Design a protein around this ligand. Structure first.
Ligand SMILES: [Mn+2]
Ligand SMILES: [Mn+2]
Lengths: 306, 7, 376, 583
């Protein structure tokens, strides 16, 4: 591998916020398109890991996340999904995290989120960001394809269930998810959708999601989904809580949210869940990183072709 | 609050 | 203001109260100083006093009213509480409300009712309703309190219609604001409310539409489409733009071309808007003029149809869903040659969103099932 | 008859269908004059691309970039006045990005004209732009005044001054804003008499423009006018105006004054500063708008740092300081935080005596502030109070409070104290440190946040650098070797982590017998992250070791690490073998 010396050169670069090129991405996404299709719907993940949630393009905060819980080879990772949308630097976030896959192929693990879709990606940030950062819908095209290959869920130590969204009435056995075909854009209905579009709540039973789609599910749903499946804990993101992490359903499910307060202009601390050697959980609550050249680019901004 | 697809 | 001390020696007190109700209570974001309830109650009675009694607005209160309003209203506006840049979306959020509204609500309300009185003689008032009065009133539309502008909208809209003299100055004045706006301050949070006014103003234009206003549409209104935050005020703009084309159809070529030059790349919600008002224009288009832009339009139009962004592609192709627009197309054959290739390479497979996939099919069907049975 | 290929063939782009096809033609206009005749360019090309391109503005932004570089590609100095027509048209375009460039292009090319060519071409160019039909023209000309002035005739100097006078008074606030901006720029093109004669009224007229968006732009330029050598000549010409701007009902002016308050000071002179700016500064710090006080506080040190002779200590003591002790306890979270950024530098100025009495009950107060960023700005500048105030008095008041912060909730705060430990525990802790602060300095290695472990690790190479070496072996290394047992791999990686940064300051003997026996004991750890960071760790601490005690001690460990589970252990133990040259 004389290509692997260029790869940590790519990574070295884009760790300073500067992005990768048109072709650099196309082949980065291709080399990650293939190192991914090997993984399964549920992806059995080795024990010591840090589990992260939604980062939504908040690059300089994703950096704050690494300053909080180690750098990317030296500390194992696992993301929920939702890298690309509400923030400013989506292109630089999803391109950093993917690079850190195809290089350190076991030192990180990236799951698919509701936002790793064509339709959401262009009804929120990403697509228009690619459009002003490249001039063509090509880097967007590549990233949306690599999105399809991202695994729908993960299984740490056969015990802690890591998925982006939540539970579905079209799943039962963990094996049901394994039987799905995820090599496609996320649909509006169906197990896949629910898997990465739904939330728990204080309601009991399945309920209707206030989100477009998915389902709400009470502490009864996950409890029984736990006690017959594997069952230490369900871990998810996708739904912000101001503590950064939130513990619900008689501690049957934690929600980990990993993007703090800016265009998540709400006011939340973000958090990560560290699963150690024996597999106990600690939670690190970080605030957003201090910024610079602050809110003023001195108002000399470029147009939008106009 | 920013819109419920979702603060 | 008491409407109790006979008829005369009553005008003597009203003027006393709107000097009384003019030593304004400079702090409402720091604690309390009540027994400034007097002020409130009193300018409340003054608001009652002028909307119930005949012949009360006599010559010597105009000055005293305008003084009262100006002393009360013409602040330096504060540093907008929400930090801003290019990063944050203009769906401007933390909507910091004016602290001292419980007095202002009335000051506005009164002065508006004053302006509205059946015996508000404007030939008397003009003397005291300065350009400089208008000017101040104007840099107030920059308030971030949505209530505040709502008042100014109607307030100025009255001052406009009431004073023919002011009208020239008013227009030129709210032009400069826009010029400040579009050519590099990109900030002002009242373009909406101002457009609403101008909406009515345009609608009240005349016999052979006067030159100044044609400029106003080309030099000012269309360029508004090119600012970052078109969303916040698009519908109102869209109105003003179509308004001209109702009155004078000969303006269609320049206003359609303008749009196509201001056509957005690298920002899609606007591209949708640009289509959304583009169709709004076609519904009012005169067949005569359709030709002049028929080509340059459907050239750009065809790029949208293909353009990967489904929201754009849908809205673009949904032209073929409305009878009049469709009439003009299939009243031509020059129309369906620029739109031949872009609905062929992006036709068979592609466009992941299968909605614009049957739409592009129904588009080609309604185009091939026209007079010219043409193939390639 | 020619064999090579350079001149002009390459492009299918001069006649265009798309946008980038045309754009790439003007981007590659850089080689169409050198490609074909530095003689015909003037003859045909320029009277062609005058204003013939008038479709899209993005083309015109590029063309302006070109007409700037065309300095020599048309003959040079003698033949530039043919560039003016395309750029004059380019200066009058609607969109500001185009015209803002066009001016900068025209600005650059004025210098390489001729005193007698400025008079006959460049200047009447300005005359029409400033004589513009509308504002886009006029806003542009405002720039082109300063360059062509000093070189032309004193009669045309008298013309230009009149034109610039006409723009400061322009019917529209847009131009005035522009004219107002380049006022300093222009007044700096000296004629002291005309600075007094004609600029001063311009200043005082704009300073009190009905638009607060113009007034503030006049203060910004005042600093120039008031820097152009009046004196008992400032109090009458350029003071009431400035003294007025301090009180301006617009905060946006009140702001501008403070954001420049030390500049004015440095321009206005110490004589006036004592009697006039002091009470203005005094007032600015007590402004209603917190954004002014903020910008006004961010300026206390620097204002104080250049005042006067004997008054310097007195003024700061008798009238500046009472404002600070009010500001440190201020409602706003950006004043305190700003004042913090500077207040520590106010110490050497007041000296040793007054600091202990008056500045101490302010660094302490500010240290334990509610806001995290306030203390972060105090802790950054502690060096300045440590250099000139006795270390014995440093430990009696601040130390107890510094130590409490060494365990603050915010890691950014913490890292600040750790950035500071060498100095604090070096200029003080002979034997004192390794008994009063040791178990505090070490506990950062067991922190839950990484960056602290990185700050705590980097801390040791310095904590053995300026400190001992046998004591490193006696305290630092004993507790660092201990750490290897921690069940969390994160934490037991800090064993290897400290090892490779505690090798460059501890040398062979300490490493070979004490550190290394743990490293090639750690290569058999269950978690691969410890295993590849042993191979990683062995590479770093390789050159430290003796050739023999790494050829048979640090070779069979690294070769067995190329032989199992991972792809990273099978790589760091590979590229460890390379650098160490062991294959
Ligand atoms: Mn999600
Ligand atoms: Mn989400």
């Amino acid at each position: 591998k004389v290509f692997t010396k260029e790869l940590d050169q790519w990574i070295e670069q884009l760790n300073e916020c500067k992005q990768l090129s048109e072709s650099q991405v196309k082949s980065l996404c291709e080399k990650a398109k293939e190192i991914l299709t090997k993984e399964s719907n549920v992806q059995e993940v080795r024990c010591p890991v840090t589990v992260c949630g939604d980062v939504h393009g908040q690059f300089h905060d994703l950096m704050e996340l690494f300053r909080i819980g180690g750098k990317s080879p030296d500390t194992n990772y696992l993301f929920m999904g939702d890298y690309v949308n509400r923030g400013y630097y989506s292109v630089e976030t999803v391109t950093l995290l993917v690079a850190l896959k195809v290089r350190y192929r076991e030192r990180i693990t990236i799951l698919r989120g509701n936002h790793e879709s064509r339709q959401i990606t262009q009804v929120y940030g990403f697509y228009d960001e690619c459009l002003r950062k490249y001039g063509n819908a090509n880097v967007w095209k590549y990233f949306t394809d690599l999105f399809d290959y991202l695994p729908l869920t993960a299984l740490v130590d056969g015990q802690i269930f890591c998925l982006h969204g939540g539970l579905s009435p079209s799943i039962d056995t963990l094996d049901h998810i394994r039987a799905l075909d995820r090599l496609q854009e996320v649909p509006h209905e169906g197990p896949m959708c629910d898997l990465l579009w739904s939330d728990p709540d204080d309601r009991g039973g399945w309920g209707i999601s206030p989100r477009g789609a998915g389902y709400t599910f009470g502490q009864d749903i996950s409890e029984t989904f736990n006690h017959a499946n594997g069952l230490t804990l369900v871990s998810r993101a996708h739904q912000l809580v101001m503590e950064g992490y939130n513990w619900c359903h008689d501690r049957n499910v934690v929600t980990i949210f990993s993007a703090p307060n800016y265009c998540y202009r709400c006011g939340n601390q973000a958090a990560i869940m560290e699963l150690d050697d024996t597999l106990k959980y600690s939670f690190l609550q970080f605030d957003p990183a201090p910024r610079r050249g602050e809110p003023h680019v001195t108002r000399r901004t470029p147009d939008y072709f106009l | 609050x920013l819109x419920r697809x979702x603060x | 203001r008491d409407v109790p001390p006979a008829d005369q020696e009553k005008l003597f007190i009203q003027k006393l109260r709107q000097c009384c109700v003019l030593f304004d209570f400079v702090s409402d974001p720091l604690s309390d100083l009540k027994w400034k309830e007097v002020k409130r109650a009193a300018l409340s009675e003054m608001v009652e006093y002028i909307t119930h009694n005949r012949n009360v607005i006599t010559e010597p209160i105009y000055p005293e009213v305008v003084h009262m309003f100006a002393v009360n209203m013409f602040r330096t506006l504060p540093p907008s509480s929400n930090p801003t840049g290019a990063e944050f979306d203009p769906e401007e959020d933390e909507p910091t409300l004016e602290a001292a509204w419980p007095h202002l609500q009335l000051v506005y309300e009164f002065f508006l009712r004053f302006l509205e009185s059946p015996d508000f003689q404007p030939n008397i008032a003009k003397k005291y309703i300065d350009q400089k009065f208008v000017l101040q009133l104007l840099e107030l539309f920059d308030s971030e309190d949505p209530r505040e502008r709502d008042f100014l909208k109607t307030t100025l809209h009255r001052i406009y219609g009431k004073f023919l003299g002011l009208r020239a100055y008013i227009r030129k004045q709210i032009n400069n604001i826009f010029y400040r706006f579009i050519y590099e301050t990109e900030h002002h949070n009242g373009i909406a409310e101002l457009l609403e006014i101008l909406g009515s103003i345009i609608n009240g234009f005349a016999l052979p539409l006067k030159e100044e206003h044609k400029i106003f549409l080309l030099k000012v209104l269309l360029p508004l489409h090119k600012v970052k935050s078109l969303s916040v005020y698009h519908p109102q703009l869209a109105y003003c733009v179509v308004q001209f084309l109702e009155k004078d159809s000969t303006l269609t070529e320049p206003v359609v071309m303008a749009l196509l030059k201001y056509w957005p790349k690298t920002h899609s919600p606007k591209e949708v808007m640009f289509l959304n008002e583009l169709e709004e224009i076609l519904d009012v288009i005169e067949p005569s003029e359709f030709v002049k832009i028929m080509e340059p339009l459907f050239r750009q139009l065809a790029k949208c149809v293909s353009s990967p962004h489904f929201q754009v592609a849908e809205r673009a192709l949904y032209y073929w869903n409305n009878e009049y627009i469709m009439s003009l197309i299939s009243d031509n054959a020059a129309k369906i040659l620029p739109i031949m290739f872009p609905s062929l390479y992006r036709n068979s497979k592609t466009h992941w969103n299968k909605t614009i996939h049957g739409l592009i099919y129904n588009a080609l069907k309604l185009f091939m099932e026209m007079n010219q049975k043409l193939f390639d | 008859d020619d064999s090579l290929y350079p001149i002009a063939v390459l492009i299918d782009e001069l006649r265009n269908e798309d946008v980038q096809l045309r754009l790439n033609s003007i981007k590659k206009l850089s080689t169409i004059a050198l490609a074909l005749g530095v003689e015909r360019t003037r003859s045909e090309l320029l009277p062609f691309l005058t204003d013939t391109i008038y479709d899209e503005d993005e083309v015109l932004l590029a063309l302006a970039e070109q007409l700037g570089t065309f300095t020599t590609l048309v003959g040079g100095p003698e033949y530039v006045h043919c560039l003016l027509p395309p750029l004059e048209s380019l200066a009058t375009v609607e969109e500001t990005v185009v015209r803002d460039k066009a001016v900068e292009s025209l600005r650059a090319i004025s210098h390489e004209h001729s005193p007698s060519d400025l008079e006959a071409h460049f200047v009447p160019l300005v005359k029409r732009l400033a004589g513009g039909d509308w504002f886009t023209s006029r806003t542009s000309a405002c720039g082109l005044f300063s360059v062509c002035y000093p070189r032309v005739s004193s009669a045309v100097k008298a013309e230009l001054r009149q034109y610039f006078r006409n723009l400061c008074s322009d019917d529209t606030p847009m131009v005035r804003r522009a004219a107002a901006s380049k006022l300093g720029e222009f007044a700096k093109v000296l004629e002291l008499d005309n600075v007094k004669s004609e600029i001063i009224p311009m200043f005082s007229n704009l300073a009190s423009d009905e638009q607060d968006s113009v007034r503030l732009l006049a203060v910004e330029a005042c600093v120039n006018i008031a820097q152009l050598l009046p004196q008992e000549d400032l109090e009458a010409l350029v003071m009431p105006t400035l003294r007025q701007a301090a009180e301006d009902k617009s905060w946006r002016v009140r702001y501008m004054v403070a954001d420049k308050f030390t500049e004015l000071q440095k321009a206005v002179g110490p004589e006036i500063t004592k009697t006039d700016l002091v009470p203005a500064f005094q007032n600015l710090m007590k402004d209603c708008e917190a954004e002014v006080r903020a910008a006004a506080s961010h300026k206390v040190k620097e204002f104080c740092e250049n005042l006067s002779a004997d008054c310097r200590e007195n003024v700061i003591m008798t009238q500046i300081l009472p404002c600070i002790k009010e500001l440190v306890s201020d409602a706003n979270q950006h004043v305190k935080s700003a004042l913090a950024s500077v207040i520590m530098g106010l110490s050497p100025i007041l000296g040793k005596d007054n600091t202990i009495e008056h500045l101490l009950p302010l660094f302490l107060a500010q240290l334990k502030d509610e806001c995290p960023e306030v203390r972060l700005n105090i802790i950054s500048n502690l060096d300045c109070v440590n250099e000139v105030i006795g270390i014995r008095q440093l430990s009696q008041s601040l130390l107890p409070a510094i130590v409490e912060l060494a365990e603050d909730a915010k890691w950014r705060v913490r890292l600040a104290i750790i950035e500071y430990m060498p100095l604090l525990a070096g200029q003080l802790g002979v034997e004192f440190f390794d008994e009063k602060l040791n178990s505090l300095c070490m506990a950062w290695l067991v922190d839950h946040v990484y960056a602290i472990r990185e700050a705590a690790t980097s801390n040791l190479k310095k904590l053995v650098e300026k400190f001992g070496k046998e004591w490193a072996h006696a305290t630092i290394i004993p507790k660092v070797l201990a750490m290897s047992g921690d069940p969390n791999y994160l934490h037991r990686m800090t064993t290897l982590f400290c090892i490779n940064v505690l090798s460059e300051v501890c040398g062979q003997d300490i490493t070979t017998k004490h550190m290394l026996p743990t490293v090639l004991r750690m290569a058999g750890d269950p978690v691969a992250n410890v295993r590849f960071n042993v191979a990683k760790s062995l590479q770093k601490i390789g050159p430290i070791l003796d050739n023999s005690t790494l050829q048979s001690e640090v070779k069979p460990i690294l070769e067995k690490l190329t032989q199992d589970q991972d792809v990273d252990v099978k790589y760091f133990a590979q590229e460890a073998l390379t650098v160490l040259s062991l294959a």
